[PDB]
Amino acid sequence: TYNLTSDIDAAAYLEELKQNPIINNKIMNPVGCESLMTPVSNFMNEKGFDNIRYRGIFIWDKPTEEIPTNHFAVVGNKEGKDYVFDVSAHQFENRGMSNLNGPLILSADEWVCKYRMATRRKLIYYTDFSNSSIAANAYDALPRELESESMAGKVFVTSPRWFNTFKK
Amino acid sequence: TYNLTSDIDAAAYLEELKQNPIINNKIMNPVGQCESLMTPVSNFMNEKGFDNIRYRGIFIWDKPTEEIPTNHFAVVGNKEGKDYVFDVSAHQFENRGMSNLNGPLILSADEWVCKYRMATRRKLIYYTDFSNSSIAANAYDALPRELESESMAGKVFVTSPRWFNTFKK
């Protein structure tokens, strides 16, 4: 399924982003993510996106999982519509989300669809923040109990059946 | 990308539909079947306890000057509060520009939207749901029609590509 929107010229944005070796390094070897928020954000700001936010994401495989998987994307508005630059989405390509096979630059709706349709069993939710280090703190990679998590401010991309069973 | 939801046991619904030889035939040969499929699928869903059954008429437009848009039909029903779309002839588009549509679909409403949205980069896709199947077939017929004179009232947009936003003047 497609990775780059034609709502904006994502193809050309991606070309430009790859000329930043901090970014390109990850686009080629997407493992290990936060450090992208800044250069991606800066890029977007130069291209005229505004209301730039940092999206912290958790991916939960099971209720009893000890540390959820985190992930980050940057969101920005261009002519009234939200877009998500998630240039390291494809670190999930070989982790059960093979539909995430390259960097994403998508409308907000397309991005949600991309993740939703990549998996049936994983619980995926996010929060958008004004500050990237607040995002990294709230969606950190430390042990966390799903039963003790506040769903306040969490936006669900999926809700697997186990998770509704789990909530009770 | 998955074709059957795990929100309900779409795998078992699919298999039961495929147990009916008339429906099996149309799923194996889906081109042009979606209209005739509405009633039998609807009857199945009704029997399986879905309510508020509607008939979804769909246009897919390639460009503004296209003489006749491509049409399609699916059936919507509610099961324990949530809408599910049975679209068992979606794979008619597989070898026609929408290769991500590679089998029959029984999905949540939102899943069904994502499937279509992400299957094309630049087709305009929109639909309307009707209580009556023959009204749906009429509304979304395959007769000559100009995009420019379509009312957008009551259309629900799966896509709204850049070119269409422009076309809107």
Residue numbers in the entry:
A (entry chain B): 145 to 176, 178 to 313
B (entry chain A): 145 to 313
How is this structure described in the published paper?
SseI is secreted into host cells by Salmonella and contributes to the establishment of systemic infections. The C-terminal domain (∼140–322) of SseI contains its catalytic function and shows some sequence similarity (19% identity over a 88-amino-acid stretch) to Pasteurella multocida toxin (PMT or ToxA), which causes atrophic rhinitis in swine. Based on its structural matches, SseI is a member of a particular subgroup (clan CA) of the cysteine protease superfamily.
Crystals of reductively methylated SeMet-derivative and native forms of SseI (37–322) were grown as described and their structures were solved using SAD and molecular replacement, respectively. The native crystals diffracted to 2.05 Å resolution and belonged to a different space group (P212121) to the SeMet-derivative crystals (P41212). The native structure was solved using the SeMet-derivative structure as a starting model and showed two molecules of the protein per asymmetric unit. No density was observed for the first 12 and the last nine residues of each molecule. The dimer is linked by a disulfide bond between Cys258 of each chain on the opposite face of the molecule to the catalytic Cys176. The dimer is likely to be a crystal artifact since the C-terminal domain purifies as a monomer on size-exclusion chromatography. The SeMet protein was purified using 10 mM DTT instead of 2 mM DTT to prevent Se oxidation, which may explain why it did not crystallize as a disulfide-linked dimer under these reducing conditions. The chain backbone in the native structure did not show any large deviations from the SeMet-derivative structure, with r.m.s.d.s of 0.277 Å (chain A) and 0.250 Å (chain B) between the two models.
